[PDB]
Amino acid sequence: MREVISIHVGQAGVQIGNACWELYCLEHGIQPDGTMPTQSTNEGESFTTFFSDTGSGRYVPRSIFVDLEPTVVDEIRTGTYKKLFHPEQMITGKEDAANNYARGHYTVGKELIDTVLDRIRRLADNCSGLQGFFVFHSFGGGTGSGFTSLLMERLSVDYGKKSKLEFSIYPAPQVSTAVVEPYNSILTTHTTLEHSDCAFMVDNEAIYDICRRNLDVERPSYTNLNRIISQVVSSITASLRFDGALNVDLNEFQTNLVPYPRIHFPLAAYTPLISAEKAYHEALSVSDITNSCFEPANQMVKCDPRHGKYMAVCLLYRGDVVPKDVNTAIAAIKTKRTIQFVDWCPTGFKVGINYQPPTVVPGGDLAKVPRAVCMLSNTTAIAEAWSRLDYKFDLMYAKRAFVHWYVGEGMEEGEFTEAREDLAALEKDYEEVG
Amino acid sequence: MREIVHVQAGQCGNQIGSKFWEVISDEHGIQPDGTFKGETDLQLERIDVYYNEANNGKYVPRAVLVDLEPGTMDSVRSGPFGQLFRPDNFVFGQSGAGNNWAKGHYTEGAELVDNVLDVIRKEAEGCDCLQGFQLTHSLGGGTGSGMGTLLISKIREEYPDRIMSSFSVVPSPKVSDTVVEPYNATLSVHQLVENTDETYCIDNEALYDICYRTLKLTNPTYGDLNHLVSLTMSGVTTCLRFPGQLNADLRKLAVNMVPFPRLHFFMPGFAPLSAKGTQAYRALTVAELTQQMFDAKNMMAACDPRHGRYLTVAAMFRGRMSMREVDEQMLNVQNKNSSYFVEWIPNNVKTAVCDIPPRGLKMAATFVGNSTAIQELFKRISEQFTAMFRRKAFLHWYTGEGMDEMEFTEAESNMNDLISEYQQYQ
Amino acid sequence: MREIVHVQAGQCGNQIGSKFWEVISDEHGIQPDGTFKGETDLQLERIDVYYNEANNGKYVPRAVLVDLEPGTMDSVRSGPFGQLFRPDNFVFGQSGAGNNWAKGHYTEGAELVDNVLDVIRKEAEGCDCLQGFQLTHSLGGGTGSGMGTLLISKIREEYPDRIMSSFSVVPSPKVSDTVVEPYNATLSVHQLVENTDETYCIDNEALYDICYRTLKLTNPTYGDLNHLVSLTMSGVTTCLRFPGQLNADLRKLAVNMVPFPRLHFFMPGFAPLSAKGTQAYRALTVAELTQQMFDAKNMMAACDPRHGRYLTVAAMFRGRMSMREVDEQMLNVQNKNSSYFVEWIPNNVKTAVCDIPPRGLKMAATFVGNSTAIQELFKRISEQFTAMFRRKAFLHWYTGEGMDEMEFTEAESNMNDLISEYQQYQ
Ligand SMILES: Nc1nc2c(ncn2[C@@H]2O[C@H](COP(=O)(O)OP(=O)(O)OP(=O)(O)O)[C@@H](O)[C@H]2O)c(=O)[nH]1
Ligand SMILES: Nc1nc2c(ncn2[C@@H]2O[C@H](COP(=O)(O)OP(=O)(O)O)[C@@H](O)[C@H]2O)c(=O)[nH]1
Ligand SMILES: Nc1nc2c(ncn2[C@@H]2O[C@H](COP(=O)(O)OP(=O)(O)O)[C@@H](O)[C@H]2O)c(=O)[nH]1
């Protein structure tokens, strides 16, 4: 049937995948050792998109772990989730690229790219309904940028027509770690425009704002930030892993949300995202959280949504939701005038309601709420998020700082110049279409 | 004898019939095994029209179930009345349209059209003389509006003689359902005005307004919205399945209404409609059931009936009724509402009365009207269709499939000539 | 046949009928389910005048219940005989008048007037020939005196032919009930002298004086004060509902009394009225029931009957009575009280006798009189109305709604011409 493959490249690929595949074992009733208990067969209704069958219910994830460094991969090969994954699906590196492009685009990647594309083809030949790709990466990583652009340069030659999905983290304009992240974000945007269907972005700080105010988590780290992103990942798959009245597959997401083949970069949002106590004193209706979707304390990228112009807003609901107030509240959004559209698209809405409510992680900070919304809103606030990063790249480039690492690794300096004219017209097209 | 197949394509029309066959099962006294348990043989003497009995009475519905994915197959199969359908007909693909017309028409629908074409042929070879087809699909989505669009273009090569019922949902002015919803409308109706005989433009929006006021139901289940679509369709074919003082087949419903080979775009109506507690407090007279039929409340589409003119009034009444009171009040509406009719067509009322009511009432009324305010249905979508063609958005999902730009404009000219023809006689 | 709707608006008239329909229910032998349990068909042969039977005999009263808030809805609905009323008619708003005329007339009443206007239309379309309307509301408050005021201004556009019964309570000279009570009187009567046919000025004050002396009741429940309003109204329409030796409809009660198109302001009366223990100790003769009717005690309004003149005496007697003793004593009152009549109108007594008494007695008398001492009812309020206009108080609750100052003075001139017309013939 339909079967979807996931690829995890970089350390952000490692631990986000350590949460998403951890979460899916809860939502299908699969024990982490590798087999299933017999009670979760009725829950296991069309789980075939990720898990091959082996011998007696033993379910390997159709997932590939790619890293140039063996350290964080051994965390998978130490914990409980060691026996779940397949060993020859784990392909490790030895020498690190250290957030450098040609160290991750030519040096260690080209010794390992031929090993992993076989493991792509070894697994994908079982498919008769191969839909899409979950590729997880960063923007400033050596293998996060240098290998990811090269990997998407090769799978479009192989499979082409079949879809792709990229999840990543938007680098914050104020608080971020690596100094080469303004460099590599221009590099990972250069040749991945042509080789990616859609790519999503989240902020470190925009997670933190709801963590401190609504979750009331005043000591967050990369443990709980992986759980919050994984709920957004799981809510997309709920249209596919279960039987809904009006649901949507991966080819349909890009068909609605891509108005032009270059501007295809929306973001995410999730609500209700609060702690376990505040849901007790409040009855969260449909009109409650849907109006909570379109306020700037709910976006997952810290920018100005009111200074952006909405073009195609996508909505996926979960839980037992009636469509009457849905057909009212989205109309009640249209009664408000602050939600600005473009003049040519009034019909940029998507309706999706699944029967299954989201189930929370065990021992987590969330609360069991029936209603939830995964808001996807492509807008022109991405252009205002382009200018904050195009300011960082050029001024460090003008003094030619940190160029002496990019030179000797098999890389040219004129490629920095061509990406400048490439990204200049990109943020222009938000204002040209808008 | 007079035999009709029912074909479902796209996610909309696949679940409409899934509640609709149940009433057809229950009006004739059969079981999910197809076991006849009707007490009177009035439920058996016209059982053959939608069924092919084989090998000790397990009646199979003359139904074809097509999808581009196996998602909607198992839900109907494991759901209610799943054992009744013939597993020979479970033909499907592995793509999914992704709300794309040229995928459903040129790319992916062109593969699966050959398999069910023989299935259309196979059940039509085992009968003496076919009568017409009934088709449930969508016009907003991509599967039924792309694949069921092309199916009518090949029925006329097999059977250029009979009638074609193409029941499909239509967009609403208030809230759009999909993003390419004006694209899926103009390109479909381009083929619907070529080779079809009737479409019933049912708005998703106004069905809640029926349920919110009459039924007062706070929780609209999608089984219940199609249930009001289910009782509409069963009242249309009551003459072919039941006797009475005046019988009227689908061709008589066709020939009385459509005046010109394009204007066949009709909206349906049904009375009585109310909640539970208002049963005894109103009257079950001919007069009370009359004025409900001619209200904006009973308009299943969200168009205003006092912004148009009724051309052909079809009154399919169900139940033991007095003919003269039907003859009384159908005169009386034109003595009241002569502005609400077209003027140059005299005697706008067509009346067909079967003496059998549906299960659950004592006297019912199945209305199908022709208001020229349905011109505004194609006014509102022709602007939304030309809202995005002026900026050439989403062209890489159609030209990337291989669609012509003139395929838009040829449909766009024929869309605008359509509202000129309602304007011709209004 | 001859059909009459009963409409209630404002908190006063909503609870008057709530005990009044009970007697109408009990005089004709029906139940809160509407189940007819009358033993003799005399209680059935004119049941149609206030009812529309539908679907196995659950009679619904031809009643419309309007409020600006849902407060008075549920109390009537959950109270006694709550299951009898049709839930189609439960039309209401969400404002509350707050004792403001221009809210009830211009601001908030203008919204809810459209919904029940079709409800006035709907029950009048299902009949052959309407007869007239009866309306219970207030003149002191804000809801009924503001919204029911405007309703009569739109009945004449629908039906400029029939009669209009506008029963409403009036202010008393002793203790005012609300603060803007002279404002709610002059502005209402400005519209009441334009398009109405009868008003019964019932004082809230003198109803206790009836209960304190005759009934001797120490605890006046508001169910009991409207109970004396209930038996007054049922005796008026006894001819249309029961046979007898002389029948007299509401139009005959109209045409005999009103001499000029303004002077139709009548006070009612009822006899016998006493407590429990004085039953056997008095006499049930024509002579004892006569002189009770012409006492200041029986004056339901607090005006002095020997400070005016009876113009038209309406004697609606109920019970098996001797006609000659009625013919005897109605002569004898004018041989006693010739000063108490107008002089130039001969034979001031109008007599209508139905041979059916109300339930609970053996012989009763329903009196409606026309004293010209009701001139003092509009003398006392025209000074209180002009008590606060001289200081322009509370103008920011009316001009803030958008009321004209000339709207006061145009009503104020027509208020003072009204008492000149009682002065014309006194
Ligand atoms: N929040 C979060 N961010 C991560 C995590 N892992 C990596 N990142 C992001 O990845 C960016 C840089 O990429 P890295 O993961 O450090 O390097 P890489 O992708 O493994 O590529 P190499 O240099 O070849 O090792 C940083 O800016 C981080 O924000 C993680 O576990 N949690
Ligand atoms: N009433 C009702 N309408 C539905 C249901 N499912 C889909 N629809 C309608 O069908 C339209 C979408 O068409 P669909 O067949 O689902 O897309 P497709 O599969 O690509 O052809 C929408 O406008 C929905 O309103 C349902 O269960 N009930
Ligand atoms: N007998 C009786 N009179 C009432 C009752 N309720 C209100 N009234 C009279 O109604 C008058 C007030 O009018 P009302 O309708 O309450 O004010 P509104 O709602 O603003 O129109 C007062 O003079 C009261 O005497 C009741 O239950 N019984």
Short mmCIF file of C-alpha atoms and ligand atoms in Angstrom, two decimals, chain A residues 245-246, chain B residues 10-13 15 97 99 138 140-145 169 177-178 181 204 222 225-226, ligand 2:
data_model
loop_
_atom_site.label_atom_id
_atom_site.label_comp_id
_atom_site.label_asym_id
_atom_site.label_seq_id
_atom_site.Cartn_x
_atom_site.Cartn_y
_atom_site.Cartn_z
CA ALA A 245 -14.21 11.95 7.17
CA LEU A 246 -12.32 14.59 5.16
CA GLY B 10 -14.38 10.62 -5.64
CA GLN B 11 -14.48 10.81 -1.84
CA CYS B 12 -17.73 12.83 -1.84
CA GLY B 13 -19.94 10.51 -3.89
CA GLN B 15 -19.98 8.13 1.11
CA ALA B 97 -5.74 12.89 -7.17
CA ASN B 99 -7.03 17.86 -5.90
CA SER B 138 -17.92 15.99 -6.56
CA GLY B 140 -14.98 20.77 -5.59
CA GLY B 141 -12.45 17.99 -5.16
CA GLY B 142 -10.04 16.40 -7.58
CA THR B 143 -10.87 12.70 -7.84
CA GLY B 144 -14.57 12.77 -8.67
CA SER B 145 -14.37 16.07 -10.54
CA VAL B 169 -22.08 19.02 -4.73
CA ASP B 177 -13.90 24.30 0.84
CA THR B 178 -10.73 23.73 -1.21
CA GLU B 181 -12.36 24.97 -5.93
CA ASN B 204 -22.89 22.32 1.56
CA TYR B 222 -21.85 13.63 7.94
CA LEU B 225 -26.25 15.50 5.98
CA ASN B 226 -26.14 12.79 3.31
N1 LIG D 2 -21.86 16.15 3.26
C1 LIG D 2 -20.65 15.59 3.04
N2 LIG D 2 -19.84 16.15 2.11
C2 LIG D 2 -18.63 15.63 1.85
C3 LIG D 2 -18.20 14.44 2.59
N3 LIG D 2 -16.97 14.12 2.14
C4 LIG D 2 -16.64 15.04 1.20
N4 LIG D 2 -17.63 15.93 1.02
C5 LIG D 2 -17.61 17.06 0.07
O1 LIG D 2 -16.84 16.71 -1.08
C6 LIG D 2 -16.04 17.81 -1.51
C7 LIG D 2 -14.62 17.32 -1.73
O2 LIG D 2 -14.57 16.39 -2.81
P1 LIG D 2 -13.79 15.00 -2.61
O3 LIG D 2 -14.49 13.86 -3.31
O4 LIG D 2 -13.64 14.70 -1.14
O5 LIG D 2 -12.35 15.26 -3.26
P2 LIG D 2 -11.76 14.20 -4.30
O6 LIG D 2 -11.68 12.84 -3.65
O7 LIG D 2 -10.37 14.62 -4.71
O8 LIG D 2 -12.65 14.15 -5.51
C8 LIG D 2 -16.07 18.85 -0.40
O9 LIG D 2 -16.68 20.05 -0.87
C9 LIG D 2 -16.91 18.25 0.70
O10 LIG D 2 -17.88 19.19 1.16
C10 LIG D 2 -19.14 13.89 3.58
O11 LIG D 2 -18.84 12.87 4.25
N5 LIG D 2 -20.31 14.50 3.75
#
